[PDB]
């Protein structure tokens, strides 16, 4: 350690403590450099002495770390602000600011007024956001050469399961439209996590299947109870019918087990009577949740008890709200004493039970009061289905966000390339001291495509070669130009001139990342009166 | 905390940790095993042929030695054998390939070369994988004896051959239209006290040792129907509520004997309604078992709810509360045998079940208390074969010659797939041949010249079909030596070694918070 | 060592490591010394004088070592340089990385004799396929372009930036005039630096070029007999004597009168004996001068040690200072004696032309001698590159494209044989690889980007690297089909002599 240790609070009073925190901040930033992007390296990090974890998510890393420097501290604070926004873009704000807090003390020292370098940072931030709104050169996912299909296919090509993603392109286009759950502004996009996605292992690997209406994963191979009757009305049952232990009415003090025996013969009868009054009301397909014993299952299958048991609750809450059903309008008992009412039923045009991949699933075709869709996949094995699940969700999230912001930008350091340049071109127009506020800011953008290239083993020098070769001086216009380009694909770390890929992040995740990365260098400046305490 | 370690020093520190582990275990491998001797820090000698017992007792270093145990416990959980084999592969690739590729500085193309190496492995593996008959025990006896003969103990290997080859064929999935590999809960090994190997009967089914221990309880019923609550058992298990005296020692004794008396009153319905097996997943006292002798009914205690479903579907037990008031009974037979044998005062109930979802635990007998465990060790290597022959009737020959055959198949595709990929892709091919070179190093010859004669053997006449002996160091037919390599081990250990070598390559920073 | 005896400088560590480590460090400066160079090597000497150069033969003679393995190989690099021209940069860098690969076989446990015989089988098989990699020949040595096509690689092996103007200019200064049928001057090609008229104004002057200023009038005939003398003429100054400053000035006048009539008769006796030109390695006397103008005899004011010895060789004269009236024992040979203004300097030009006895001398004009004495080093190996002693030089791919052409063959040949010599044949193909890996690191990219392509192109002969962008990113540069050539003979010895040195230095442990 440099600086005096006789004084308290680790105070070194000047250029040494300004040289201290540039070391303390860069070492934090150097961690994210290894883990930057999809090609970023996984770090094994011990928690106490024996507990470890393997991460390349920078916000998860900073949750593990315990700060001992303010340069360690404020980088953890500003990155968690973007983390509660999305969780994405948290990697970029950490690496850039380490160079920024080297550059800020040199120039805020040099005041005519000290915030001019900071306002030069904010003017550089606002110069970005204007041209951020001017970006349609790279990253359109609201359309393509064909549709959102062209966006999704390159997004499903960015998430590798082989060469596939062609049939998988149509799933991502449907997912914002199959869901109708109310977002802000009533947008035609809708959240992609409400989609009922089902697996079906062992068929053509390329194959994927779309189902009009929601698709319920119901069990086959254990139950043989009546479920194949075609209806248009479903009933959703948060219910359980056991034979073993369902009713208690005698204490353990009475010396007569005969009193405990005679009430048992009444609880076994009401489970069979319960499904009769439900089917007498008008239902012909009912959907029962689990919660019964392992001894009570085997009696319902071979003898006959009409239900569809142990259905997934994650689908059943979606379908009952999709079909017009209620699961809570008659729950005052969990036994077979009440009858069934007509307001609990769901509505569809038909309910057909199609057996496919040797699996009889209950397909709710065209749910009523909101018409939806679901997707069941076709892999060749279990793990091959397990790979394409993670291949979907990132393409589900990135396309949903580009539909929100009409102007959308490239991802990674691709958009930062013109921001490294044409802000410095903008900086010279401002003239005086505030020029290097913008220029050192735009200089610090360059390391983000560079360190991701080293993680992709592309090593940063063809990356600064191509991106400067694109940017036209006579045509500083991006529009869709064949005279300058700004795009770059990150999964190879080499610029593939693309605008349909899933590696180009929208406006919204980037403009806030420019805020907190700017703010973090401002955050270290906010001291008055550096002192010690006894 | 605040901690950052610069790159090359950690990845090289991963090499120094893993390779030194890979040193003695490579020489502890196979019938040319050495012994890894741990001196105790409090004094005392421990040497085995298993470094996992050695490493987990001693101070494990941080950088790469922690991950090798983690890949070993997965390797030990599935098949058991091959934990010695996984750790020597990844560290050898970590040593040989990485250090000059560190100088050319690319992590990524090395990781992609692992993906190229794993796929080239499978293609040449299936072509030499030889089908043996799963319908013939002697075709399976030849390979199950090869896994036991890694030791010098071969007297009761044939006793391990008899029991395991038919039990794991009965151990299947819950999907029940499917074979391959058994699951550890559904195939267990426990020792049965006393006994002789001339009485070690081949058990395929599940044994229940929480059953009869006294001859008044259930005697030779082909369908031992396990009986849960609600007509022959009731819910009252409490107290007749005598007064609470805080200043007496005899108060706390009376409240417990009054608790047992209502358990006596529960089993009064067991006399009148006549089960044959009653169950209690909370466990009953031994004094509750004496009144079940008056009922002539066995008890089942200290068990769980999931143990009773998997046996009753297997042994054909009907889930009833009365046998005179039935409850839509289960299957009537799934059992091939009902046999109860006694050792001392301990009856051990066996029931042999046929193609069933049972939680199997087999019968094994030795001659003595220590040699009961020697039979138990032999059935452990037996079940790795029986799952593999259930998994893959095809399997390769080899004594490490297959490891050369994978290594030469990469080298041909190294020269065929020309480009930037080949230099990590050929370097990891060099790492494979060192291991059988070390096995014939203990055999003792010019093992480097034999390593040339390994490679000249491969592409010319036989890859590893005519292979190499790993107890003589001579190029022999591995089909005619009778020593075979398990194909699942050829699958699994190669899949685990490439994943660990990726993760140790990606790391260059460790923290402690 | 356990005892008082056994004085030795090698052993178990030192022979395995430190002998190769010493050969590593000498080859460490020659990583970029052949082919395209960005590398430069400043040296202060045993003379302690600042020079930068890229010829290792200038560097390695400045280098000293006590390692005999490191000491021996630079003699074999001279043996290639005595035989052919450039490629003496290659002999050290090829054998240096060759021996580093031999350490790795000694890491495994291979016997040294297995490593010894391993490269020997590889040395023979490569020399078999090497004349099958002959792609051209110098079909017309009288052509300027075919001569300049060979020379661009060797000048590039000193500097890439001057490869094209000099290769023309050397052919313009006519190494082309030799039929090479046993015809090659080794000292009548001797490069003559003329200071001034900067380096692109370097010129051509056939026959013997003397920088020294021509004093007096021109020779009476161009067919003159050439008298080459060590110091015939003197110049007088003295100081205080045993008794200080002698007793009179009369004998100073008396010694001065006979001194003029002495040098009067010296120019007279040369004029009588038939020689019409005198060469003075000493200074010019004034009294000798004004009789030499009337006698119409050309005079050189001063000459160095190298000026007389070329004249005693080419003309055939005898160099001795004449304190006597000189007679002709010198036998003038050149039939054409000219005066030329080269670099605006009075330059003595001697000239004769024969079939296998011609003279054609390189002259250079540059504004800095310390630049131009390194430019002539690009010329020095380039002229000796013409000495293949054949017209058709069996031209192979230049630049180093033959190395990857060879390395495909050798590791294929190394795979087919059995043995523990089997591995060193495969390591021998790796020894071709190390030089373009070291050159591409001066080009500006990594080696694995480059060396992947040159193996993947095919048996082509053309594909290589220069120092351009085509060298960097695609790693494809036409170092065969763009005026870049090498000969068979320079490639044949440099592989041979690097092999015999490295096999020799590997056996020793003392």
Swiss-Prot record, chain A:
Catalytic class of the enzyme: hydrolase
Record key words, sorted: Acetylation, ATP-binding, Chaperone, Cytoplasm, Cytoskeleton, Disease variant, Epilepsy, Hydrolase, Intellectual disability, Nucleotide-binding, Phosphoprotein
Residues bearing PTM N-acetylmethionine: 1
Record-listed Phosphotyrosine modification sites: 181
Annotated GO MF terms: ATP binding; ATP hydrolysis activity; ATP-dependent protein folding chaperone; protein folding chaperone; RNA binding; ubiquitin protein ligase binding; unfolded protein binding
EC number from the UniProt entry: 3.6.1.-
InterPro entries cross-referenced by the UniProt entry: Chap_CCT_alpha, Chaperone_TCP-1, Chaperonin_TCP-1_CS, Cpn60/GroEL/TCP-1, GroEL-like_apical_dom_sf, GROEL-like_equatorial_sf, TCP-1-like_intermed_sf, TCP-1_chaperonin
Phosphoserine PTM positions: 6, 491
Illness: Intellectual developmental disorder with polymicrogyria and seizures: An autosomal dominant neurologic disorder characterized by a broad phenotypic spectrum. Main clinical features are developmental delay of varying severity, intellectual disability, seizures, and polymicrogyria. Additional variable features are non-specific pyramidal or cerebellar signs, and visual impairment.
Name of the protein: T-complex protein 1 subunit alpha
Species: Homo sapiens
Lineage: Eukaryota, Metazoa, Chordata, Craniata, Vertebrata
Curated annotation (Swiss-Prot), chain B:
Amino acids binding ADP: 30, 82-85, 150-151, 399, 470-471, 485, 490
Modified residues (Phosphoserine): 158, 231-232, 240
Cystine residue pairs: 354-360
InterPro entries cross-referenced by the UniProt entry: Chap_CCT_gamma (IPR012719), Chaperone_TCP-1 (IPR017998), Chaperonin_TCP-1_CS (IPR002194), Cpn60/GroEL/TCP-1 (IPR002423), GroEL-like_apical_dom_sf (IPR027409), GROEL-like_equatorial_sf (IPR027413), TCP-1-like_intermed_sf (IPR027410), TCP-1_chaperonin (IPR053374)
Cross-link (Glycyl lysine isopeptide (Lys-Gly) (interchain with G-Cter in SUMO2)): 3, 236-237, 369
EC number: 3.6.1.-
Entry-annotated residues carrying Phosphotyrosine: 235
UniProt function note: Component of the chaperonin-containing T-complex (TRiC), a molecular chaperone complex that assists the folding of actin, tubulin and other proteins upon ATP hydrolysis. The TRiC complex mediates the folding of WRAP53/TCAB1, thereby regulating telomere maintenance. As part of the TRiC complex may play a role in the assembly of BBSome, a complex involved in ciliogenesis regulating transports vesicles to the cilia.
Protein name: T-complex protein 1 subunit gamma
Source species: Homo sapiens (Human)
Curated annotation (Swiss-Prot), chain C:
Pfam families documented for this protein: Cpn60_TCP1
Positions that bind ADP: 34-35, 87-90, 156-158, 399, 486
Cross-link (Glycyl lysine isopeptide (Lys-Gly) (interchain with G-Cter in SUMO1)): 446
Localization terms from the record: Cytoplasm; Cytoplasm, Cytoskeleton, Microtubule organizing center, Centrosome; Cytoplasm, Cytoskeleton, Cilium basal body
Family: Belongs to the TCP-1 chaperonin family.
Reaction catalyzed: ATP + H2O = ADP + phosphate + H(+)
CDD domains: TCP1_theta
Oligomer status and interactors: Component of the chaperonin-containing T-complex (TRiC), a hexadecamer composed of two identical back-to-back stacked rings enclosing a protein folding chamber. Each ring is made up of eight different subunits: TCP1/CCT1, CCT2, CCT3, CCT4, CCT5, CCT6A/CCT6, CCT7, CCT8. Interacts with PACRG. Interacts with DNAAF4. Interacts with synaptic plasticity regulator PANTS.
Keywords: Acetylation, ATP-binding, Cell projection, Chaperone, Cilium, Cytoplasm, Cytoskeleton, Hydrolase, Isopeptide bond, Nucleotide-binding, Phosphoprotein, Ubl conjugation
Binding site for Mg(2+): 86
Disease per UniProt entry: De novo genetic variants in nearly every subunit of the TRiC complex, including CCT8, have been found in individuals with a broad spectrum of brain malformations, and clinical phenotypes ranging from mild to severe epilepsy, developmental delay, intellectual disability, ataxia, and other features of cerebral malfunction.
InterPro entries, per the entry: Chap_CCT_theta, Chaperone_TCP-1, Chaperonin_TCP-1_CS, Cpn60/GroEL/TCP-1, GroEL-like_apical_dom_sf, GROEL-like_equatorial_sf, TCP-1-like_intermed_sf
Modification sites for Phosphoserine: 10, 149, 200, 256, 304
Name listed for the protein in its UniProt record: T-complex protein 1 subunit theta
EC number(s) given by UniProt: 3.6.1.-
GO BP term (any one): protein folding
Source organism: Homo sapiens
Top-level taxon of origin: Eukaryota
């Amino acid at each position: 350690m440099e600086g005096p240790l006789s004084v308290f609070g680790d105070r070194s009073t000047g250029e040494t403590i300004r040289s201290q925190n540039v070391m303390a901040a860069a070492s934090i930033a150097n961690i994210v450099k290894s883990s930057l992007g999809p090609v970023g390296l996984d770090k094994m990090l011990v928690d106490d002495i024996g507990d470890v974890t393997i991460t390349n998510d920078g916000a998860t890393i900073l949750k593990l770390l315990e700060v001992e420097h303010p340069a360690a501290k404020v980088l953890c604070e500003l990155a968690d602000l973007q983390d509660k926004e999305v969780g994405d873009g948290t990697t970029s704000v950490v690496i850039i600011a380490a160079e920024l807090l080297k550059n800020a003390d040199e120039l805020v020292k040099q005041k005519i007024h000290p915030t001019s370098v900071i306002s030069g940072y904010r003017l550089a931030c606002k110069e970005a956001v204007r041209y951020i709104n001017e970006n349609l050169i790279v990253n359109t996912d609201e359309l393509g050469r064909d549709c959102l299909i062209n966006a999704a296919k390159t997004s499903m090509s960015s998430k590798i399961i082989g060469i596939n993603g062609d049939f998988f392109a149509n799933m991502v286009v449907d997912a914002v439209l199959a869901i109708k759950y109310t977002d802000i502004r009533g947008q035609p996009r809708y959240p992609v996590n409400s989609v009922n996605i089902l697996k079906a292992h062992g068929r053509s690997q390329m194959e994927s299947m779309l189902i009009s209406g929601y698709a319920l994963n119901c069990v086959v191979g254990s139950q043989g109870m009546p479920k194949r009757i075609v209806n248009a009305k479903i009933a959703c049952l948060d219910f359980s019918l056991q034979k073993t232990k369902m009713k208690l009415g005698v204490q353990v003090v009475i010396t007569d087990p005969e009193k405990l025996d005679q009430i048992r013969q009444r609880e076994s009868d009401i489970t069979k009577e319960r499904i009769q009054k439900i089917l007498a009301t008008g239902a012909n397909v009912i959907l029962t949740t689990g919660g019964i014993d392992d001894m009570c299952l085997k009696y319902f299958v071979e003898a006959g008890a009409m239900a569809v048991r142990r259905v997934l609750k994650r689908d059943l809450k979606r379908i009952a709200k999709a079909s017009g059903a209620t699961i809570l309008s008659t729950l005052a008992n969990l036994e077979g004493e009440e009858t069934f009412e007509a307001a609990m039923l769901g509505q569809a045009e038909e309910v057909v039970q199609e057996r496919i991949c040797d699996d009889e699933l209950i397909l709710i075709k065209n749910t009523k009061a909101r018409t939806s869709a679901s997707i069941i996949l076709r892999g060749a094995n279990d793990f091959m289905c397990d790979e394409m699940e993670r291949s979907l969700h990132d393409a589900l999230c990135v396309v949903k966000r580009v539909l929100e912001s009409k102007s959308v930008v490239p991802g990674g350091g691709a958009v930062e390339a013109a921001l490294s340049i044409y802000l410095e071109n903008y900086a010279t127009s401002m003239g005086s001291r505030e020029q290097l506020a913008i220029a050192e800011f735009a200089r610090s953008l360059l390391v983000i495509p560079n360190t991701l290239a080293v993680n992709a083993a592309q090593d940063s020098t063809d990356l600064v070669a191509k991106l400067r070769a694109f940017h036209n001086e006579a045509q500083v216009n991006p529009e869709r130009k064949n005279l300058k380009w700004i795009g770059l694909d990150l999964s190879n770390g080499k610029p593939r001139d693309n605008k349909q890929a899933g590696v180009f992040e929208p406006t919204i995740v980037k403009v806030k990342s420019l805020k907190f990365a700017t703010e973090a260098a401002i955050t270290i400046l906010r001291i008055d009166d550096l002192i010690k305490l006894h | 905390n605040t901690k950052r370690e610069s790159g090359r020093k950690v990845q090289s520190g991963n090499i120094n940790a893993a390779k030194t582990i890979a040193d003695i275990i490579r020489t502890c491998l196979g019938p040319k095993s050495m012994m890894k001797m741990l001196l105790d820090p409090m004094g005392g000698i421990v040497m085995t042929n298993d470094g996992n017992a050695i490493l987990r007792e001693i101070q494990v270093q941080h950088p790469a030695a922690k991950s090798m145990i983690e890949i070993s416990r997965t390797q030990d959980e599935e098949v058991g054998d091959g934990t010695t084999s996984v750790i020597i592969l990844a560290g050898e690739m970590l040593s040989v390939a990485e250090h000059f590729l560190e100088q050319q500085m690319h992590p990524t193309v090395v990781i992609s070369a692992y993906r190229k190496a794993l796929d080239d492995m499978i293609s040449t593996l299936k072509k030499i994988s030889i089908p043996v008959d799963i319908s013939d025990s002697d075709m399976m006896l030849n390979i199950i004896n090869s896994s036991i003969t890694t030791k010098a103990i071969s007297r009761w290997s044939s006793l391990a051959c008899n029991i395991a080859l038919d039990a794991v064929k009965m151990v299947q999935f819950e999907e029940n239209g499917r074979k391959e590999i058994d699951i550890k809960k559904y195939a267990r090994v426990e020792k049965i006290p006393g006994g002789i190997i001339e009485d070690s009967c081949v058990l395929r089914g599940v044994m229940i040792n929480k059953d009869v221990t006294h001859p008044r309880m259930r005697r030779y019923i082909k369908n031992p129907r396990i009986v849960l609550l609600d007509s022959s058992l009731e819910y009252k298990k409490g107290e007749s509520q005598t007064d609470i005296e805080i200043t007496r020692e005899e108060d706390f004794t009376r409240i417990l004997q009054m608790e047992e008396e209502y358990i006596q009153q529960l089993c009064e319905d067991i006399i009148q309604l006549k089960p044959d097996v009653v169950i209690t997943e909370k466990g009953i006292s031994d004094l509750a078992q004496h009144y079940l002798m008056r009922a002539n009914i066995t008890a089942i205690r200290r068990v769980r709810k999931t143990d009773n479903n998997r046996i009753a579907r297997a042994c054909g037990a009907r889930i009833v509360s009365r046998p005179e008031e039935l409850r839509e009974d289960d299957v009537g037979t799934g059992a091939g045998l009902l046999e109860i044998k006694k050792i001392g005062d301990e009856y051990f109930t066996f029931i042999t079940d046929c193609k069933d979802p049972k939680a199997c635990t087999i019968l094994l007998r030795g001659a003595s208390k220590e040699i009961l465990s020697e039979v138990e060790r032999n059935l452990q290597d037996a079940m790795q074969v029986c799952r593999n022959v259930l998994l893959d009737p095809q399997l390769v020959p080899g004594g490490g010659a297959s490891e050369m055959a994978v290594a030469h198949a990469l080298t041909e595709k190294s020269k065929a797939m020309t480009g930037v990929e080949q230099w990590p892709y050929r370097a990891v091919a060099q790492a494979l041949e060192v291991i059988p070179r070390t096995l014939i190093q203990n055999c003792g010859a010019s093992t480097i010249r034999l390593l040339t004669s390994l490679r000249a053997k491969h592409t010319q006449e036989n890859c590893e079909t005519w292979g190499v002996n790993g107890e003589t160091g001579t190029l022999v037919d591995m089909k005619e030596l009778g020593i075979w390599e398990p194909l699942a081990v050829k699958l699994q250990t190669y899949k685990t070694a490439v994943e660990t070598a990726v993760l140790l390559l990606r790391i260059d920073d460790i923290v402690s918070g | 060592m356990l005892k008082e005896g056994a004085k030795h400088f090698s052993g178990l560590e030192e022979a395995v490591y430190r002998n190769i480590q010493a050969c590593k460090e000498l080859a460490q400066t020659t990583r970029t010394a052949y082919g395209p160079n960005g590398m430069n090597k400043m040296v202060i000497n045993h003379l302690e004088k600042l020079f930068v150069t890229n010829d290792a033969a200038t560097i390695l003679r400045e280098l000293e070592v006590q390692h005999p393995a490191a000491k021996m190989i630079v003699m074999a690099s001279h043996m290639q340089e005595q035989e052919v021209g450039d490629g003496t940069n290659f002999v050290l860098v090829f054998a240096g990385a060759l021996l580093e690969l031999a350490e790795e076989l000694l890491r495994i446990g291979l016997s040294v004799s297995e490593v010894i015989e391993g490269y020997e089988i590889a040395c023979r098989k490569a020399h078999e396929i090497l004349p099958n990699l002959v792609c051209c020949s110098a079909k017309n040595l009288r052509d300027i372009d075919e001569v300049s096509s060979l020379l661009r690689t060797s000048i590039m092996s000193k500097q890439y930036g001057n490869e094209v103007f000099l290769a023309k200019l050397i052919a313009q200064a006519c190494v082309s005039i030799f039929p090479d049928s046993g015809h090659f001057n080794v000292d009548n090609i001797r490069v003559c630096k003329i200071l001034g008229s900067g380096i692109s104004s370097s010129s051509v002057l056939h026959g013997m070029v003397f920088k020294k200023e021509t004093e007096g009038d021109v020779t009476s005939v161009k067919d003159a007999k050439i008298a080459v003398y060590s110091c015939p003429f003197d110049g007088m100054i003295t100081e205080t004597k045993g008794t200080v400053l002698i007793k009179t000035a009369e004998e100073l006048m008396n010694f001065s009168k006979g001194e003029e009539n002495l040098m009067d008769a010296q120019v007279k006796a040369i004029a009588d004996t038939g020689a019409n030109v005198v060469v003075t390695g000493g200074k010019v006397a004034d009294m000798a001068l004004h009789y030499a103008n009337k006698y119409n005899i050309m005079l050189v004011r001063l000459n160095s040690k190298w000026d007389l010895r070329r004249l005693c060789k080419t003309v055939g004269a005898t160099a001795l200072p004449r304190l006597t009236p000189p007679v002709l024992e010198e036998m003038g040979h050149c039939d054409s004696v000219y005066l030329s203004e080269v670099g605006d300097t009075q330059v003595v030009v001697f000239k004769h032309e024969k079939e296998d006895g011609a003279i054609s001398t390189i002259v250079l004009r540059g504004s800095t001698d310390n630049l131009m004495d390194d430019i002539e080093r690009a010329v020095d190996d380039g002229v000796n590159t013409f000495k293949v002693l054949t017209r058709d030089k069996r031209l192979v791919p230049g630049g180093g494209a033959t190395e990857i052409e060879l390395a495909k063959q050798i590791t294929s040949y190394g795979e087919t044989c059995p043995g523990l010599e089997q591995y060193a044949i495969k390591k021998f193909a790796e020894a071709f690889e190390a030089i373009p890996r070291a050159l591409a690191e001066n080009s500006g990219v990594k080696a694995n980007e480059v060396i992947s392509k040159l193996y993947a192109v095919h048996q082509e002969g053309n594909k290589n690297v220069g120092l351009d962008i085509e060298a960097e990113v695609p790693a494809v540069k036409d170092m065969l089909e763009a005026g870049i050539l090498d000969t068979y003979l320079g490639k044949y010895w440099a592989i041979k002599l690097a092999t015999n040195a490295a096999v020799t230095v590997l056996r020793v442990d003392q």
